[PDB]
Design a protein around this ligand. Structure first.
Ligand SMILES: O[C@H]1c2c(C(F)(F)F)ncc(OC3CC(F)(F)C3)c2C[C@H]1F
Lengths: 104, 107
């Protein structure tokens, strides 16, 4: 899997809800963009990463840019994939995420 | 409303979200391959070229540009494009530009 192949974009409202997701998210994590709309990213985070991700978000919201560092994202058919995400606030109107899958 | 696109540093569309139909009237394949500057108003072409040139020097920070974009239905629409470079720090591939493109009021 090439680097471009492990990267997908997502867009979020200020409350973390998906408003847009690349179709690439499908072959990586199972979900279809269509079924992610309106659901908060927070629902998909491993419990052990929840607080870190809340803080990453808080740093994004005040500074405009953030690197999540590593976190586990719940796959559609069970299991957690590791990800890293660069987030950017577009002014606030939305959050743009460039998400890279650290797993296999 | 708005649509995301990705470009190479020369301005060429390399990815376009389907939200573009409702925003500017084209299908993704009518944009893919072409340089964004080909859809831009001749008075705004240079500002736009210079903006692509600068976004790659701003250390992955957000650069915003406002320009007129020729919709499929023929008309000049005012667009606000906020853009930023991304480069996967695991690799040394050339960065590319991620854009969000919104129809805004000039007023
Ligand atoms: O809080 C923002 C965020 C971040 C952050 F690091 F930038 F803060 N990282 C991952 C995020 O969502 C995941 C990307 C995904 F995989 F699509 C779900 C999100 C949703 C945004 F609202």
């Amino acid at each position: 899997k090439g680097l471009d192949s492990k990267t997908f974009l997502s867009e979020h409202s200020m409350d973390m809800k998906f408003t847009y997701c690349d179709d690439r998210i499908t072959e990586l994590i199972g979900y279809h963009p269509e079924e992610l709309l309106g659901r908060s990213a927070y629902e998909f985070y491993h419990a052990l990463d929840s607080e870190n991700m809340t803080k990453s978000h808080q740093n994004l919201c005040t500074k405009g840019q953030v690197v999540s560092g590593q976190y586990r994202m719940l796959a559609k058919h069970g299991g957690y994939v590791w990800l890293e995400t660069q987030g950017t606030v577009i002014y606030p109107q939305c959050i743009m995420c460039v998400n890279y899958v650290l797993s296999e | 409303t708005r649509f995301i696109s990705r470009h190479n540093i020369e301005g060429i569309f390399t990815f376009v979200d389907h939200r573009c139909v409702a925003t500017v009237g084209y299908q993704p394949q009518e944009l893919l391959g072409k340089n964004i500057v080909e859809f831009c108003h001749p008075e705004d072409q240079q500002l736009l070229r210079d903006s692509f040139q600068q976004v790659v020097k701003l250390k992955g920070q957000v650069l915003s540009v406002m320009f007129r974009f020729r919709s499929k239905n023929q008309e000049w629409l005012w667009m606000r494009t906020s853009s930023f470079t991304f480069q996967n720090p695991y690799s040394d591939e050339i960065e590319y530009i991620i854009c969000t493109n919104t129809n805004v009021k000039n007023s």
